[PDB]
mmCIF file of C-alpha atoms and ligand atoms in Angstrom:
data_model
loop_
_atom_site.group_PDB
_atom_site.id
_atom_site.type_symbol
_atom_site.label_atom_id
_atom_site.label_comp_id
_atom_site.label_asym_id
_atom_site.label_seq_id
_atom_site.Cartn_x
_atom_site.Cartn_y
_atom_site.Cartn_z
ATOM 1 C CA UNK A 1 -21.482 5.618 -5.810
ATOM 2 C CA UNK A 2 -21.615 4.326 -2.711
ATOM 3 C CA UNK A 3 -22.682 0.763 -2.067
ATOM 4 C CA UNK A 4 -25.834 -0.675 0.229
ATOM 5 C CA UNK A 5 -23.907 -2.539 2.643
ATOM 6 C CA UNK A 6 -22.142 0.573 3.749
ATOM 7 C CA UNK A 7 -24.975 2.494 4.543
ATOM 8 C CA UNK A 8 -26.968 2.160 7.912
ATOM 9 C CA UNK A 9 -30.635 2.693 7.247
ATOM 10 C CA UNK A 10 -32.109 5.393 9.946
ATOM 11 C CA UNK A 11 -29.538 7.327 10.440
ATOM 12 C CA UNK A 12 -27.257 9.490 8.440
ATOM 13 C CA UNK A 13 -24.001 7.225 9.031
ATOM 14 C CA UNK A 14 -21.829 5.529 6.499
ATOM 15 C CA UNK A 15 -19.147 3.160 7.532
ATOM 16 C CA UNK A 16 -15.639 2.638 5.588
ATOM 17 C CA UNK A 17 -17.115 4.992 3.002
ATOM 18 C CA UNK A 18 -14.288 7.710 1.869
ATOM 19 C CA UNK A 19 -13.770 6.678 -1.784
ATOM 20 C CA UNK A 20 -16.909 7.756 -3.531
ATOM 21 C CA UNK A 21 -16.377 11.620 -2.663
ATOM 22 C CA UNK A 22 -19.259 13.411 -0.649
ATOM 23 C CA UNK A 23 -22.055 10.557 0.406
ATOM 24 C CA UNK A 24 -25.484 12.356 -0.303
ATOM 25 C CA UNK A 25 -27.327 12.318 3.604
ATOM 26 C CA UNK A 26 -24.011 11.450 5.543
ATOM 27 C CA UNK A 27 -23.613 13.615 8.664
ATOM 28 C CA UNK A 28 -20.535 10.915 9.996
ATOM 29 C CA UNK A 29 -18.568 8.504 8.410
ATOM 30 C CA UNK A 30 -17.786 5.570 10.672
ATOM 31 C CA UNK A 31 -13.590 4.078 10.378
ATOM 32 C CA UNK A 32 -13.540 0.494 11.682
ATOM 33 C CA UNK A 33 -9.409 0.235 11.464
ATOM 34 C CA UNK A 34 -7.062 1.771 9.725
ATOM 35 C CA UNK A 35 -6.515 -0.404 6.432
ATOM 36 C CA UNK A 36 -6.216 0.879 3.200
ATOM 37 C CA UNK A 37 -8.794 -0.877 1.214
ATOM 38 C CA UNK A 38 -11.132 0.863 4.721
ATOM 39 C CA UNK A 39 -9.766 4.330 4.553
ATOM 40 C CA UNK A 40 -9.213 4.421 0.761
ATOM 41 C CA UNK A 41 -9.787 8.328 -0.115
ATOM 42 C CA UNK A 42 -9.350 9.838 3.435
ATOM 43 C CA UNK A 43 -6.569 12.611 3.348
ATOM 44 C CA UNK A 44 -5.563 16.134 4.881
ATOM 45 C CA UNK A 45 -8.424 17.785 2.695
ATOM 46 C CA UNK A 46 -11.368 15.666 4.274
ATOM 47 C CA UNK A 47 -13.736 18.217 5.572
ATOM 48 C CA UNK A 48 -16.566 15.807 7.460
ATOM 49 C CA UNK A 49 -16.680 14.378 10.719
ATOM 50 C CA UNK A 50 -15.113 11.294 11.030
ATOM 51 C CA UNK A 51 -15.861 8.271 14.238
ATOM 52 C CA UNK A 52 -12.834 5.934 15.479
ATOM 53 C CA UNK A 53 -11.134 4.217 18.364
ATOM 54 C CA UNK A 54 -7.839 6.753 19.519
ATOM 55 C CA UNK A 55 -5.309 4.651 17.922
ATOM 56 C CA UNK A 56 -7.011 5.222 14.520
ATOM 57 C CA UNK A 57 -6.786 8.514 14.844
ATOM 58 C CA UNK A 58 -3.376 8.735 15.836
ATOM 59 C CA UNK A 59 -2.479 7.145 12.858
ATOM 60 C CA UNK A 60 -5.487 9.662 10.613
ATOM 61 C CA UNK A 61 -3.644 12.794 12.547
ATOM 62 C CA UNK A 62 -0.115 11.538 11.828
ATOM 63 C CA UNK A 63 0.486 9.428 8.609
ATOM 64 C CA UNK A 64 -2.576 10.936 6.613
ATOM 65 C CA UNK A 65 -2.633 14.319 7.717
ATOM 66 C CA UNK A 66 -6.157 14.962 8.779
ATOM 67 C CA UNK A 67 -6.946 17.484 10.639
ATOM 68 C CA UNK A 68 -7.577 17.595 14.151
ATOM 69 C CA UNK A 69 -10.963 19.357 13.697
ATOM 70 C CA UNK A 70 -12.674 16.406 11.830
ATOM 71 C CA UNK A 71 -11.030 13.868 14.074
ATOM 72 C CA UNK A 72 -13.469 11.923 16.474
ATOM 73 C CA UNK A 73 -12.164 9.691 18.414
ATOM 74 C CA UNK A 74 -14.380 7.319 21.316
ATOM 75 C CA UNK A 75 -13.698 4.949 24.118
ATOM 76 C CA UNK A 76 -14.347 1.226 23.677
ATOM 77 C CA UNK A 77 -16.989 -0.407 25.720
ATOM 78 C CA UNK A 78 -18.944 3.136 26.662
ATOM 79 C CA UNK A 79 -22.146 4.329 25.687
ATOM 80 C CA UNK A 80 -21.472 6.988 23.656
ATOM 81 C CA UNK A 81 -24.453 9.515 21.438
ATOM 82 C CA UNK A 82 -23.571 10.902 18.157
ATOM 83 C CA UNK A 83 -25.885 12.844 16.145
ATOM 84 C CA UNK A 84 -28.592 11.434 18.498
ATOM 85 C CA UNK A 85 -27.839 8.180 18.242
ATOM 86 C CA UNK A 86 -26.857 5.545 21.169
ATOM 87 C CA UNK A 87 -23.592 3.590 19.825
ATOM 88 C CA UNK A 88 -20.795 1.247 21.281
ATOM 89 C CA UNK A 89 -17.393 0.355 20.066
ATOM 90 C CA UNK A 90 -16.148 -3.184 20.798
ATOM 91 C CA UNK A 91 -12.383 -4.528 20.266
ATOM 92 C CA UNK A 92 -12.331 -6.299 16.834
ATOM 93 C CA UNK A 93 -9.244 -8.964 17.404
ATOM 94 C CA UNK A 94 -8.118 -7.825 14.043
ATOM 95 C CA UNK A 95 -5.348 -5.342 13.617
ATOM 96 C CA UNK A 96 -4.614 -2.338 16.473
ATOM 97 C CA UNK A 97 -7.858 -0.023 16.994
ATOM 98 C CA UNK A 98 -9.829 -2.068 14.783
ATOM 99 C CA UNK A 99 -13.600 -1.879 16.129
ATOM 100 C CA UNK A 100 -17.121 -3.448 15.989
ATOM 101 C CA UNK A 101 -19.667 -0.672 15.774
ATOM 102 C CA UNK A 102 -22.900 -1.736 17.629
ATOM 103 C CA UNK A 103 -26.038 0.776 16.690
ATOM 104 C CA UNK A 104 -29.169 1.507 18.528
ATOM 105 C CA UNK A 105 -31.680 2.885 15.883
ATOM 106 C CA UNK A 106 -34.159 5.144 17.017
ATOM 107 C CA UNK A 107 -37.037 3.177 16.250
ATOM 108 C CA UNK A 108 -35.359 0.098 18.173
ATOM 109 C CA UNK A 109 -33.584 -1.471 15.569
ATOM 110 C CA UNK A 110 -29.965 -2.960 17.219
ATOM 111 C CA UNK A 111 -27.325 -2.941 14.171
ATOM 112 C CA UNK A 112 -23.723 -5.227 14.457
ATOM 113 C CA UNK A 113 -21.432 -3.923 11.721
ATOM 114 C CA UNK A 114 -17.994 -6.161 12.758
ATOM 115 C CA UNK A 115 -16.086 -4.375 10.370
ATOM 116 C CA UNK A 116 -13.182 -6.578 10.320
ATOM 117 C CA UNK A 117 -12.534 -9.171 12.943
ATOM 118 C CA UNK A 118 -11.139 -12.659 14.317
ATOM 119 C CA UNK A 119 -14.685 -13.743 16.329
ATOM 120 C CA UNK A 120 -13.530 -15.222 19.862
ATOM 121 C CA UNK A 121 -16.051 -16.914 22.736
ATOM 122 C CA UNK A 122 -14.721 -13.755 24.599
ATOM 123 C CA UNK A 123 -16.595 -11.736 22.563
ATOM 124 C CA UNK A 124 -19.783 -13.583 24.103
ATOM 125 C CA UNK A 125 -19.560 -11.218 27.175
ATOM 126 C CA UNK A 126 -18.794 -8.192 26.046
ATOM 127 C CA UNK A 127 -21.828 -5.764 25.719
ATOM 128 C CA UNK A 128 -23.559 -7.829 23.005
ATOM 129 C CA UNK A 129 -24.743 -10.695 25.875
ATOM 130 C CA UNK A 130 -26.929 -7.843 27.092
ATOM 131 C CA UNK A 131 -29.595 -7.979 24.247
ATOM 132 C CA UNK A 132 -31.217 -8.780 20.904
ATOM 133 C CA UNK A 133 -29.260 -7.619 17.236
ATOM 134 C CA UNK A 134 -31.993 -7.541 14.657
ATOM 135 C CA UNK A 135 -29.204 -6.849 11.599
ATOM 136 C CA UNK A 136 -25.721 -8.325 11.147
ATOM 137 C CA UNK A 137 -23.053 -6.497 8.828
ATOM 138 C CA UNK A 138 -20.538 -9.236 8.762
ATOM 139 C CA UNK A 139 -16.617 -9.781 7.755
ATOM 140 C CA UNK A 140 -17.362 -13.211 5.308
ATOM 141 C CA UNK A 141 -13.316 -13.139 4.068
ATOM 142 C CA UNK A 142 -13.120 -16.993 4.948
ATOM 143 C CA UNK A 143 -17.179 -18.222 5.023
ATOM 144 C CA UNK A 144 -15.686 -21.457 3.462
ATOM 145 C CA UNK A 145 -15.231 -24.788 5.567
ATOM 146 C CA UNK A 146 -11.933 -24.984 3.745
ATOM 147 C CA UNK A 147 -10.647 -22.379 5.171
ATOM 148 C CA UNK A 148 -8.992 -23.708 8.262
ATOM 149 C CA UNK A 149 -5.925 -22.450 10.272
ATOM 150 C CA UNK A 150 -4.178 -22.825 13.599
ATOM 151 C CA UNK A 151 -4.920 -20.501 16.410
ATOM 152 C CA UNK A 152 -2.496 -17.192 16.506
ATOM 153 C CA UNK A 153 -1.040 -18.565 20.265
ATOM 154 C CA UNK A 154 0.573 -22.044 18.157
ATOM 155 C CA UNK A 155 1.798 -19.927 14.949
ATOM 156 C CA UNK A 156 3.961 -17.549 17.458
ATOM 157 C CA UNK A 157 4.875 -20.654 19.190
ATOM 158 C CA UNK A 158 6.225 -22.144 16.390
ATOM 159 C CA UNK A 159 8.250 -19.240 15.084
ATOM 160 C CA UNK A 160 9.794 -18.090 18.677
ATOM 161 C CA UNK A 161 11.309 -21.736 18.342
ATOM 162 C CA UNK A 162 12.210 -21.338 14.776
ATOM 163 C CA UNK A 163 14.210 -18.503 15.428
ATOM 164 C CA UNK A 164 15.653 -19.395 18.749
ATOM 165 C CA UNK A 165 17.145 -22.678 17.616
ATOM 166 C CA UNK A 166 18.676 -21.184 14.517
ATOM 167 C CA UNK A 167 20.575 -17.906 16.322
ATOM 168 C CA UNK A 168 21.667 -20.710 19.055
ATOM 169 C CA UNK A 169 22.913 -22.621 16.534
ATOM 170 C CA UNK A 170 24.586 -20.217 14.603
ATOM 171 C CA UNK A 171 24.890 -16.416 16.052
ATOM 172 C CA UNK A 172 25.660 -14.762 13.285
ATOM 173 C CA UNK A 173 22.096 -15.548 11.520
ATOM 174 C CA UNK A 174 20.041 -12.469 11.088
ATOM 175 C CA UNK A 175 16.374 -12.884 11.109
ATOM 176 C CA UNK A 176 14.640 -10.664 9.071
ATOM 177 C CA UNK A 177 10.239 -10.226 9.222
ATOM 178 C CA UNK A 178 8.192 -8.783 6.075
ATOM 179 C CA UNK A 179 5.353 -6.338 6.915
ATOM 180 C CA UNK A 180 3.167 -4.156 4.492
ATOM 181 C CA UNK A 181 0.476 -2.671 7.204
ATOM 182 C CA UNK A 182 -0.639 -2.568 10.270
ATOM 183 C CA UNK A 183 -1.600 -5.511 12.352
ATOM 184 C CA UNK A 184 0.442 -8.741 12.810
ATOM 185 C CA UNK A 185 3.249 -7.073 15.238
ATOM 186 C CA UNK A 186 2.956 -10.145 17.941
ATOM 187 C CA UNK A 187 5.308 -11.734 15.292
ATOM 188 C CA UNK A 188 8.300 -9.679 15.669
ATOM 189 C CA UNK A 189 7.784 -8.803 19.325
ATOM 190 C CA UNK A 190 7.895 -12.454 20.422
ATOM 191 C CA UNK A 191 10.562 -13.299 18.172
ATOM 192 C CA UNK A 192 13.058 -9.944 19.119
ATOM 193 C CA UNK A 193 12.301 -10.832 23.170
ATOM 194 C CA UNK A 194 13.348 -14.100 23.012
ATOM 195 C CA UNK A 195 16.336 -13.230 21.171
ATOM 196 C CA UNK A 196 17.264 -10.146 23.888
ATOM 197 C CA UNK A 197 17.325 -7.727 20.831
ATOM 198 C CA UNK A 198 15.123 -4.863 19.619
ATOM 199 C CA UNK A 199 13.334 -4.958 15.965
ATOM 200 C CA UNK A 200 14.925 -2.635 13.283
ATOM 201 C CA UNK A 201 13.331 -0.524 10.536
ATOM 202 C CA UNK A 202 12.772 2.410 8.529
ATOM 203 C CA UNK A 203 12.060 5.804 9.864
ATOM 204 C CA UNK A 204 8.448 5.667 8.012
ATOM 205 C CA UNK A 205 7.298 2.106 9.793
ATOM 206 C CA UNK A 206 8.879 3.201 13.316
ATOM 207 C CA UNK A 207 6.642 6.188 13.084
ATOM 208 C CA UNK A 208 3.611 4.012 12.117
ATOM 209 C CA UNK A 209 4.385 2.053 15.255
ATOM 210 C CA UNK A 210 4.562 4.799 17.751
ATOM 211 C CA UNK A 211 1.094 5.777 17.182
ATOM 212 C CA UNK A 212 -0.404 2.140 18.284
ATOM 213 C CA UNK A 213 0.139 2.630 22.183
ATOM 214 C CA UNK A 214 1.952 -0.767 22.481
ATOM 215 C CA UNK A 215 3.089 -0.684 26.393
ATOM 216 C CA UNK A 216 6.627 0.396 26.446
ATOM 217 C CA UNK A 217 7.501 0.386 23.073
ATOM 218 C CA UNK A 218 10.429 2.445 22.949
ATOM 219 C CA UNK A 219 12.076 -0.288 24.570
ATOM 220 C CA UNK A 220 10.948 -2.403 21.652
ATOM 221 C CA UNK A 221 11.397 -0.843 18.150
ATOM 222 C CA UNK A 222 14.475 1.049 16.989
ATOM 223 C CA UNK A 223 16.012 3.012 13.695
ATOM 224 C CA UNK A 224 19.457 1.869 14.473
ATOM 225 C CA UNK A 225 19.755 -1.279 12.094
ATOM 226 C CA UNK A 226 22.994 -1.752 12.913
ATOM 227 C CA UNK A 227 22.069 -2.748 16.940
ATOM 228 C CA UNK A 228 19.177 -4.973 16.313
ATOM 229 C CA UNK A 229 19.037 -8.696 14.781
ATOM 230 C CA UNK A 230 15.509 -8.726 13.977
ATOM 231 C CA UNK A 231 14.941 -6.699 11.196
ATOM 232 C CA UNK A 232 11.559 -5.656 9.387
ATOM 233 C CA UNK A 233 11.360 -5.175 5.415
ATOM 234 C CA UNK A 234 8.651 -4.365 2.915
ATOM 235 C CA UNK A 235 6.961 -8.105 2.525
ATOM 236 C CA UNK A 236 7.482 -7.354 -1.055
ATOM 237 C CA UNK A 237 11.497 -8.015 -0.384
ATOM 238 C CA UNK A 238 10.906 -11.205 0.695
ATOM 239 C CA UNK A 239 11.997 -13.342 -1.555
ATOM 240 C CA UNK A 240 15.408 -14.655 -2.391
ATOM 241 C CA UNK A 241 17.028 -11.392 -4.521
ATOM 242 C CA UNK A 242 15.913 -9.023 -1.676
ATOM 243 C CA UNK A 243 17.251 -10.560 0.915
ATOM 244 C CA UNK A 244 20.474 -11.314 -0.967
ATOM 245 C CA UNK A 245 20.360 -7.891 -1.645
ATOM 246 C CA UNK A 246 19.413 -6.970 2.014
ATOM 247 C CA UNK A 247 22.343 -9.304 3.696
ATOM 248 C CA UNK A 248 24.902 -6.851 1.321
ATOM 249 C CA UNK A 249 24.003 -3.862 3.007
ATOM 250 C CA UNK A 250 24.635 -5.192 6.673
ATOM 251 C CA UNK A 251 28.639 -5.545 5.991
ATOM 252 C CA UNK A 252 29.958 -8.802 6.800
ATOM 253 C CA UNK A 253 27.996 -8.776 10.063
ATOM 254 C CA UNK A 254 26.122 -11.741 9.037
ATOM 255 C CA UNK A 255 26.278 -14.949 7.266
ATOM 256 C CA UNK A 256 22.694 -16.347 7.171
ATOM 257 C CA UNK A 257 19.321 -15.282 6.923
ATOM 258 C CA UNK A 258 16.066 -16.657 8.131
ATOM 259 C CA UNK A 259 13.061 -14.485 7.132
ATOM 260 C CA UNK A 260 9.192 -15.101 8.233
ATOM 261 C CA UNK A 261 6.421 -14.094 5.724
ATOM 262 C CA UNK A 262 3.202 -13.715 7.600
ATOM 263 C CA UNK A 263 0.311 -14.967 5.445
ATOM 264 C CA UNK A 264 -3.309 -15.404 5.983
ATOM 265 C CA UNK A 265 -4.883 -18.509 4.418
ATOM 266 C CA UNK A 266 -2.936 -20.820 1.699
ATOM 267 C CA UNK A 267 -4.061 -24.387 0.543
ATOM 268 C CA UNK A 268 -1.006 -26.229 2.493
ATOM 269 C CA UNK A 269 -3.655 -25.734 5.217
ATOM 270 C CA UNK A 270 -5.392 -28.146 3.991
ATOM 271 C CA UNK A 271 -3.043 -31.146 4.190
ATOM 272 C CA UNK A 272 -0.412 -30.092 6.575
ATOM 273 C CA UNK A 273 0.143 -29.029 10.220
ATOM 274 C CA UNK A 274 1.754 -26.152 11.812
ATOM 275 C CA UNK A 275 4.393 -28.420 13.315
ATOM 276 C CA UNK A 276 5.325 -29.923 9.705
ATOM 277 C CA UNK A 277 6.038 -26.223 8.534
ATOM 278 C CA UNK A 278 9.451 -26.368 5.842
ATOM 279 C CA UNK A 279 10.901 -23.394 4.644
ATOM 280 C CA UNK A 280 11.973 -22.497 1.157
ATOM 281 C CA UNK A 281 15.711 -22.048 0.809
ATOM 282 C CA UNK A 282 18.373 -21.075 -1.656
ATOM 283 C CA UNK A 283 21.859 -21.158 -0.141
ATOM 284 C CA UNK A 284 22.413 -19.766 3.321
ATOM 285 C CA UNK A 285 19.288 -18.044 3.076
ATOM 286 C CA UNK A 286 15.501 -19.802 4.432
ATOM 287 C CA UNK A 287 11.930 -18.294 3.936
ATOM 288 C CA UNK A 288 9.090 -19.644 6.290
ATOM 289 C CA UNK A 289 5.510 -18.770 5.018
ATOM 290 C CA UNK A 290 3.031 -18.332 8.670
ATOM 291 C CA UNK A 291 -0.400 -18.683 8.770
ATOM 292 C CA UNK A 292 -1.321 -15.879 11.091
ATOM 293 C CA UNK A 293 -4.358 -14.699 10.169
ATOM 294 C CA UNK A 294 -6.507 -11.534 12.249
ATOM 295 C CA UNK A 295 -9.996 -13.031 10.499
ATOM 296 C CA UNK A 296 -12.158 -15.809 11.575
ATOM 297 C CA UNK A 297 -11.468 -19.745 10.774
ATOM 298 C CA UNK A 298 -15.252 -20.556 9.260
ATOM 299 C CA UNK A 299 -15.632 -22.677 12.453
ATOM 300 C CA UNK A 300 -14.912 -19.378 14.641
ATOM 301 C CA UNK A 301 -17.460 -17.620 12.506
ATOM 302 C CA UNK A 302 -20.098 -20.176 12.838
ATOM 303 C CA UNK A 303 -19.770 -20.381 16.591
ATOM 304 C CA UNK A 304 -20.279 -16.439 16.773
ATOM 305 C CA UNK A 305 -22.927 -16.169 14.426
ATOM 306 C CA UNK A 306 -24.678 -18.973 15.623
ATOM 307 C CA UNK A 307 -24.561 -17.761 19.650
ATOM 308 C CA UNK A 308 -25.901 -14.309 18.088
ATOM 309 C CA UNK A 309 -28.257 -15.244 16.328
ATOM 310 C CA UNK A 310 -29.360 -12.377 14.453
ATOM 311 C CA UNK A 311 -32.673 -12.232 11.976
ATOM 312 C CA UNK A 312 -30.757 -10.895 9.188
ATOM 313 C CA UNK A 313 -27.081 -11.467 7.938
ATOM 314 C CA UNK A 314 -25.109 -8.518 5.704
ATOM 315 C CA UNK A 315 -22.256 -9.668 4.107
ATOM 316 C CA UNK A 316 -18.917 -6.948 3.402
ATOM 317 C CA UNK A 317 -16.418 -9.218 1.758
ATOM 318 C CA UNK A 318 -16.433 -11.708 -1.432
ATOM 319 C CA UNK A 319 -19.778 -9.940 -2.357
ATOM 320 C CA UNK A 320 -18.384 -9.405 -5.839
ATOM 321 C CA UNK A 321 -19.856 -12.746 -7.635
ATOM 322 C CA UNK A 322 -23.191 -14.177 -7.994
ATOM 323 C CA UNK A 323 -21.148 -17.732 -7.088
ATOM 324 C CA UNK A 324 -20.269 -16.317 -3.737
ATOM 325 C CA UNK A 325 -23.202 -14.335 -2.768
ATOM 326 C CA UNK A 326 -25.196 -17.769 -3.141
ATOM 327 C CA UNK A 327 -22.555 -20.176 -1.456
ATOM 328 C CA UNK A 328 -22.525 -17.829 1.620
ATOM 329 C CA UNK A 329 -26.123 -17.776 1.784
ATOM 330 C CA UNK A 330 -26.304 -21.490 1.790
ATOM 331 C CA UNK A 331 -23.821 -21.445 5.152
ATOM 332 C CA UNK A 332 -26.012 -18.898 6.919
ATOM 333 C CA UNK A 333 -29.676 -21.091 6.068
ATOM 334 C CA UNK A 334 -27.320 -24.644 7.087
ATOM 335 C CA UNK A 335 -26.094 -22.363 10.366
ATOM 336 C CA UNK A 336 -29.751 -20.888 11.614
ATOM 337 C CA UNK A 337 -31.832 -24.491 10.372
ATOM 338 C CA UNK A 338 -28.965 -26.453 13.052
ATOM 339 C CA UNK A 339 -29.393 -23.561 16.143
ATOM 340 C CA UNK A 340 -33.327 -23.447 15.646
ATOM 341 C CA UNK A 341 -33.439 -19.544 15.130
HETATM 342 NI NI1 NI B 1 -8.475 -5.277 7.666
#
């Protein structure tokens, strides 16, 4: 059955909803990005309308095989009415076509549902400056002070460098970059320009990639392995037998590998910087872990919450635990008691 805090009272909408079967009242089901745990249970048999930016449903059309039918897709930042209701979809800073989903009930309730997202003071004028949000439905993944990390800007800095010192130093070092969805690409891209090379992969994640409308990708991305020396893998080969295993298959080409394993949050946050970054190695192979994440730092949550002040706060991740249900309401009575709303 289908839980509370993916149902939008006053309407007959459910958001990231797909894995319970047919949702009793639902006349659209709402897709906020295209991320497994969010579409788990869409497939080529789904028979109901379904709402999403374009590059979701590029990749619902092409790597799940719905149907072109049940396939809604609508503009960001426009006014839009479906089933008689006003809504809005706002860029998420997550992963590409993620969206915010803002909802103007009939009776003049406003609704944010963030789905996922990395907040940003850019997102304070955007269509939300322009009134009052009376319910919040909010991405909580890191609503922990712990939970700190560098801005996405000094993690690329940091691995352009990485890589461009170690090719310099020894051209026949292959850099290799794990991957196991969408979202993160910035990685590879800035690495493979500032080596003057395109990023191999399989035939499956070059297809995934040519339904993201990335400005002139096909001068990006390639199949041909062979040409490129950035490579992408599975993130589960990342470790020190895959990428022995990996460096076989290229043929006496190459003599070193550095690999990059994009992470969100781990506790060496909480001691060391970005600049003090060491990578584990074994032989002529090195493995940097990278903390970009695509949610929000507590402190970047705060700061949104608190300039949106909305009467009521929904929570749609760690909701699983009495611990964490309590602990998060704690943050949002500290956050509203310190802003005066
Ligand atoms: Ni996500």
């Amino acid at each position: 059955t289908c839980p509370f805090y993916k149902k939008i009272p006053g309407t007959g909408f459910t958001v990231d909803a797909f894995q319970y079967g047919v949702v009793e009242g639902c006349t659209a089901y709402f897709l906020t990005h295209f991320h497994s745990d969010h579409y788990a249970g869409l497939s080529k048999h789904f028979t109901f309308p379904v709402y999403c930016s374009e590059i979701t449903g590029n990749l619902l059309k092409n790597k799940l095989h719905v149907q072109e039918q049940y396939i809604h897709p609508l503009p960001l930042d426009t006014e839009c009415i479906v089933n008689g209701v006003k809504v809005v979809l706002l860029d998420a800073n997550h992963c590409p076509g993620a969206v915010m989903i803002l909802f103007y009930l009939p009776n003049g309730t406003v609704i944010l549902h963030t789905g996922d997202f990395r907040a940003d003071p850019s997102m304070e004028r955007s269509l939300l400056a322009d009134q009052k949000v009376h319910m919040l439905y909010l991405d909580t993944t890191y609503c922990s002070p712990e939970y700190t990390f560098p801005s996405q800007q000094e993690v690329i800095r940091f691995a352009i460098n990485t890589a461009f010192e170690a090719v310099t130093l020894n051209p026949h070092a292959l850099v290799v970059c794990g991957t196991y969805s969408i979202g993160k690409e910035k990685v590879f891209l800035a690495i493979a320009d500032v080596l003057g090379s395109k990023v191999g992969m399989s035939q499956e994640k070059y297809k995934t990639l040519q339904c993201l409308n990335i400005p002139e990708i096909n001068s990006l991305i390639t199949t041909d392995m062979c040409s490129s020396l950035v490579h992408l893998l599975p993130m589960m080969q990342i470790n020190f037998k895959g990428l022995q295993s990996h460096l076989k298959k290229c043929g006496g080409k190459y003599n070193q590998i550095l690999a990059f394993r994009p992470t969100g949050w781990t506790h060496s946050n909480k001691f060391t910087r970005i600049a003090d970054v060491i990578p584990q190695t074994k032989g002529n192979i090195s493995i940097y872990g990278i903390p970009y994440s695509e949610h929000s730092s507590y402190l970047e949550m705060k700061r949104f919450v608190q300039w949106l002040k909305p009467q009521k706060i929904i929570p749609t991740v760690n909701v699983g635990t009495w611990k964490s249900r309590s602990t998060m309401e704690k943050y949002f009575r500290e956050w509203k008691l310190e802003a005066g709303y």
